[PDB]
Amino acid sequence: HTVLQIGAGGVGSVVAHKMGMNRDVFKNIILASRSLDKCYAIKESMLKKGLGEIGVEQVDADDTQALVALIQKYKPKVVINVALPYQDLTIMQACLETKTHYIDTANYEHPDLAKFEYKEQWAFDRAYKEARILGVLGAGFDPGVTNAYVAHAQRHHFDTIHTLDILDCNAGDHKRPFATNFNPEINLREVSSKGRYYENGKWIETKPLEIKQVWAYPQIGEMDSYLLYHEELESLVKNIKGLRRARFFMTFSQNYLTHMKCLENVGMLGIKEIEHQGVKIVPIQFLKTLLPDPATLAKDTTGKTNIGCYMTGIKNNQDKTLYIYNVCDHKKCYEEVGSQAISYTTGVPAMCAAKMICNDTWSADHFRAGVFNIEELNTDPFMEELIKQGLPYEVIER
Amino acid sequence: HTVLQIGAGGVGSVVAHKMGMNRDVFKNIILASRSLDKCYAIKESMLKKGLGEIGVEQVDADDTQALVALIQKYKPKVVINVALPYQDLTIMQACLETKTHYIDTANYEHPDLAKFEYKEQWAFDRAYKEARILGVLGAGFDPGVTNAYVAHAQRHHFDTIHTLDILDCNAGDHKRPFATNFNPEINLREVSSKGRYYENGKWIETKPLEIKQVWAYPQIGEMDSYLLYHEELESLVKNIKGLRRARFFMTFSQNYLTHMKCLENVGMLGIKEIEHQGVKIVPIQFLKTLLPDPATLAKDTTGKTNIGCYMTGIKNNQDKTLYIYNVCDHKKCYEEVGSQAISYTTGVPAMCAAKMICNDTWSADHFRAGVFNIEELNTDPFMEELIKQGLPYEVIER
Ligand SMILES: NC(=O)c1ccc[n+]([C@@H]2O[C@H](COP(=O)([O-])OP(=O)(O)OC[C@H]3O[C@@H](n4cnc5c(N)ncnc54)[C@H](OP(=O)(O)O)[C@@H]3O)[C@@H](O)[C@H]2O)c1
Ligand SMILES: NC(=O)c1ccc[n+]([C@@H]2O[C@H](COP(=O)([O-])OP(=O)(O)OC[C@H]3O[C@@H](n4cnc5c(N)ncnc54)[C@H](OP(=O)(O)O)[C@@H]3O)[C@@H](O)[C@H]2O)c1
Incomplete structure (x- = not known):
């Protein structure tokens, strides 16, 4: 093929x-x-x-x-x-x-x-x-496999899925003062937006990273997990019937969150272009130029990731909760395909x-x-x- | 004239x-x-x-x-x-x-x-x-009036000036998340450099903002004051005989120092140019483009400044210390000449x-x-x- x-x-x-x-x-x-x-x-x-x-x-x-x-x-x-x-x-x-x-x-x-x-x-x-x-x-x-996890739960474990929490922890250490999961222009557009979640029919908004729970991630530990809108909630609320609350949480370190609030403050996360010595420049693009692009960092990145779905529901008029998740080693990924x-x-x-x-x-x-x-x-x-x-x-x- | x-x-x-x-x-x-x-x-x-x-x-x-x-x-x-x-x-x-x-x-x-x-x-x-x-x-x-203060002490109060500490506190509030005293390109080049001071003939170097004393500034209060090289030390060590130690200290807030360490980390304080979508750009210049230029901020800046010279010495085989300083009100300056x-x-x-x-x-x-x-x-x-x-x-x- x-x-x-x-x-x-x-x-x-x-x-x-x-x-x-x-x-x-x-x-x-x-x-x-x-x-x-x-x-x-x-x-x-x-x-x-x-x-x-x-x-x-x-x-x-x-x-x-x-x-x-x-x-x-x-x-x-x-x-x-x-x-x-x-x-x-x-x-x-x-x-x-x-x-x-x-x-x-x-x-x-x-x-x-x-x-x-x-x-x-x-x-x-x-x-x-x-x-x-x-x-x-x-x-x-996320999105994708997390949808599959929810999909998979819907068939094999649940009659009706009442709640969904997607939980994404990246506990890696890229060994640099500040760097990003993937392409910084898209990553940092995502995380700095007003977070959003579905409960009881209506969608709720929150100031960026307003809500935060501590969650215990298998093979990692307890981590501050902040609430975000994420793409999969759009499709999954439409497609999984029964849903009473659907949220997405991601872990960020203090150090990451500080760098991000500073860059935001001076205007480095701006999507609108701005004239500088004639030339018209988009700051957040320039941030991506400046920052190491992430592929570079797999060589020395160590840690693990945990991503998955925590669902509560009902099967045969009895309550059950399911956690489907995947743990993944940064070093092991490097040595397989050179990536993190x-x-x-x-x-x-x-x-x-x-x-x-x-x-x-x-x-x-x-x-x-x-x-x-x-x-x-x-x-x-x-x-x-x-x-x-x-x-x-x-x-x-x- | x-x-x-x-x-x-x-x-x-x-x-x-x-x-x-x-x-x-x-x-x-x-x-x-x-x-x-x-x-x-x-x-x-x-x-x-x-x-x-x-x-x-x-x-x-x-x-x-x-x-x-x-x-x-x-x-x-x-x-x-x-x-x-x-x-x-x-x-x-x-x-x-x-x-x-x-x-x-x-x-x-x-x-x-x-x-x-x-x-x-x-x-x-x-x-x-x-x-x-x-x-x-x-x-x-500084430089200038501080030299004059030392000059003035040398004539009227001291036989020999053993030590000099110049102390610069800006306790103003420009009411913005992060902004600079004057032109950001020159200010931030200055402060992020390895600090430097003269004692016993030889000059000593320190990592940027390595040394820090708390100093009580009249009409303000006690403030963290970090050690810097400043221009006037060059001329004053040459020109004031007797000098055993000559230092310059400046106050910085945690919030300022954090923004500055973040921007430094991503490369926004770089003096060497770097290619971005063809164009070759100097980050720290772009920082100056992005940041409010300071004149703008006098309208709402409140607080006072204290700048001056703390000297120890000897006059008529007896020890004396002198503090010459000037306090200055941001709002009062605005209303006189529109500046801070x-x-x-x-x-x-x-x-x-x-x-x-x-x-x-x-x-x-x-x-x-x-x-x-x-x-x-x-x-x-x-x-x-x-x-x-x-x-x-x-x-x-x-
Ligand atoms: N759902 C998930 O689990 C998940 C997690 C992370 C990222 N993502 C998505 O995956 C993608 C990110 O992959 P990345 O992070 O690897 O991006 P990357 O590191 O920036 O590399 C992106 C590639 O796309 C190329 N490219 C972009 N626009 C192009 C165009 N118009 N024509 C030709 N080539 C073009 C770039 O060309 P240059 O070589 O010139 O840059 C580069 O080779 C994004 O779509 C992001 O939203 C999904
Ligand atoms: N010793 C002290 O007590 C102390 C304290 C602070 C600052 N300073 C010094 O004072 C100066 C800063 O004043 P500032 O902070 O007001 O700078 P500013 O706000 O950036 O304004 C600087 C002016 O200089 C103009 N300029 C710069 N290079 C030029 C050139 N080659 N040809 C023509 N015009 C030019 C700029 O033109 P644009 O209008 O195009 O920018 C602007 O009008 C610097 O020299 C700084 O080191 C001294």
């Missing part, structure tokens, strides 16, 4: 690498990005790791014509969007125009606004069912969803066709693939 | 304003800067304040020819350099070429290095004694040194001619002018 991937990110290095480790399903992996230096480093690395060999071909994913051009040049079974969420619509359109299969790991987001919303991508459901294709939205860890645990936990699920599609395990024939979030699909084989590809989960009743 | 001033800074607004308030000595004040918007706001303000009327004429002080051109266009008695320390040599040269009188408020500093040193300006002593002119170096508050207390405490002394020169009170005939620091001149009339222009001092023995 043949598949084209857009993005040579920290995440991008993982998805490609993971495809090369499953050469039995991925014979033709073509890798496409704005800057080719990244793509050759991935290419050259995989060959050093023993993982076969990939096509590098530059393209500016913002221009739909050049994608259409690249898609039909290799006519692939699926295209993986692991570039920035801006390119979601431009790549998703070039998939429709070439009747090809699309998966991303992130919502749509416009550079001139810090809004998260599926409805721009969801609009393609008529157009996609029609062109008899599939677009699987948000197939990272955030690149890792995101790329592997996307490579899995690719495998689902190529295997027709997830199919537009033998289901409705069109645009779907992960919790809508058959998750059973997806979860089994996650185990096989390095994201084993725990499952815990109380 | 006629005098030309280069700089429409926060400081610049004070020096011009203060000259207009002494119209009996300043009949022709011409004001020269890179951007004319500042100069008209000063012009238009003085007229609103009742202070007469000034000439605005743009010039790029980096190009010595255009200065020579501006100097001879109005042939003035003195030129006041209140632009950035980079223009020190270019303006100081155009003074020699036109045989005119020069005063600045800051050392020489090259944009590609964070070094403070008088020797680049001191080199002009032969050339200046020859052209029978005068260059008074560092005639702000740092702009104020710096501009007034420069306007005074101008008055000394125009009055021939400080003269190249009836003294050596050439290049001098403030402690080298007759300070008695200078101090009296400071009192008259709003910088009264206290003098305290123990």
Whole structure:
């Protein structure tokens, strides 16, 4: 099978690498990005790791014509969007125009606004069912695997899921004074926004990082976990019936939160451009220029991550709570694919969803066709693939 | 008398304003800067304040020819350099070429290095004694008035000054999350440098803000005061004989020191340029673009400043300690000249040194001619002018 991937990110290095480790399903992996230096480093690395060999071909994913051009040049079974969420619509359109299969790991987001919303991508459901294709939205860890965990609970453990708390802890040490999980422009747009959660029909808003619980993360410890809006809550509230409260929490250190409140104070997190010696510059972009980009840090990053879902509900007129979670070692990820645990936990699920599609395990024939979030699909084989590809989960009743 | 001033800074607004308030000595004040918007706001303000009327004429002080051109266009008695320390040599040269009188408020500093040193300006002593002119170096508050305080002590209170501690506290509240005394590019270059002090012949270095005493500032309170190198120590160690220890301390809040350590961590205090989307940008300059420039903040700044000199010594084989200091109110400064207390405490002394020169009170005939620091001149009339222009001092023995 043949598949084209857009993005040579920290995440991008993982998805490609993971495809090369499953050469039995991925014979033709073509890798496409704005800057080719990244793509050759991935290419050259995989060959050093023993993982076969990939096509590098530059393209500016913002221009739909050049994608259409690249898609039909290799006519692939699926295209993986692991570039920035801006390119979601431009790549998703070039998939429709070439009747090809699309998966991303992130919502749509416009550079001139810090809004998260599926409805721009969801609009393609008529157009996609029609062109008899599939677009699987948000197939990272969160969103994606967390949806799968909730999906998986809904089938196997719960009659009705009353509450959902997604909990994301990154207890890694990148050994630098201040650095980010992934691309700083998108990460820091996300976390500094007014957090948001669903309870009893209406959505509630909070000032950024207003709410905070302490949570005990298996294999780590007790950590301050702050409340955030996250993409998956949009799809999951719509798709999981019964839901009374749905929240997302993330751990941040004091040191991280301080740097972030300082940079915010001087204007370094600004999305609107500002003139400096003639030139018009966006601060938060310049922050990304200045900061080490994260791939660099996997070499010396140590720690583990824990991400998962804490659900309360009812099964056979009796109460039960479930915790599904995945722990992941930064050093172990480095030594497998040269990346750290955030690149890792995101790329592997996307490579899995690719495998689902190529295997027709997830199919537009033998289901409705069109645009779907992960919790809508058959998750059973997806979860089994996650185990096989390095994201084993725990499952815990109380 | 006629005098030309280069700089429409926060400081610049004070020096011009203060000259207009002494119209009996300043009949022709011409004001020269890179951007004319500042100069008209000063012009238009003085007229609103009742202070007469000034000439605005743009010039790029980096190009010595255009200065020579501006100097001879109005042939003035003195030129006041209140632009950035980079223009020190270019303006100081155009003074020699036109045989005119020069005063600045800051050392020489090259944009590609964070070094403070008088020797680049001191080199002009032969050339200046020859052209029978005068260059008074560092005639702000610190440096400048503090030199005068030490000078004044040396004559009137001490036989030999064993120790000198200069103490600078700014207890103002500019009502913003983070902002700077003066131009952020120069301020933040200064404070984040390895501090330095003189004791027993050799100079000692310390990591930035390594050393810290608590000091009780009259009319304020007890404040954490951190040790810094400051320009005046260079000239004063050379010029005041007897000196066993000479230090400079400045107060910084935790909040300020945190912002500064964060910005330092991400690279926002960098003097070397760095490529971003083609363009090559200096971070710390961009920081200055981003931050409110300080003049803006005088409108709502409240608090007081205390700056002065704590000296121990011997007079008539008996020990004595002297504290000379000046307290200054941010709101009171706003309402007088529209500026805050740092702009104020710096501009007034420069306007005074101008008055000394125009009055021939400080003269190249009836003294050596050439290049001098403030402690080298007759300070008695200078101090009296400071009192008259709003910088009264206290003098305290123990
Ligand atoms: N759901 C999850 O679990 C999760 C967690 C983290 C991140 N994510 C998502 O994953 C992506 C981040 O991956 P990353 O963090 O690795 O980003 P990255 O490190 O910045 O690398 C991104 C890649 O995309 C390329 N790119 C961006 N826009 C492009 C365009 N218009 N045309 C061509 N190439 C383009 C960049 O080119 P340069 O080489 O010139 O930069 C780079 O190679 C984002 O979409 C983020 O929202 C999801
Ligand atoms: N010793 C003390 O007591 C003390 C305390 C504070 C500051 N200082 C010194 O005083 C000066 C700071 O005044 P500030 O803080 O008011 O600076 P500012 O607010 O940045 O304004 C500086 C002025 O200088 C102009 N300028 C700079 N380089 C120029 C050039 N090459 N040609 C023409 N105009 C030029 C700027 O033009 P734009 O309008 O385009 O910026 C601006 O009008 C610095 O020299 C600083 O070291 C001394």
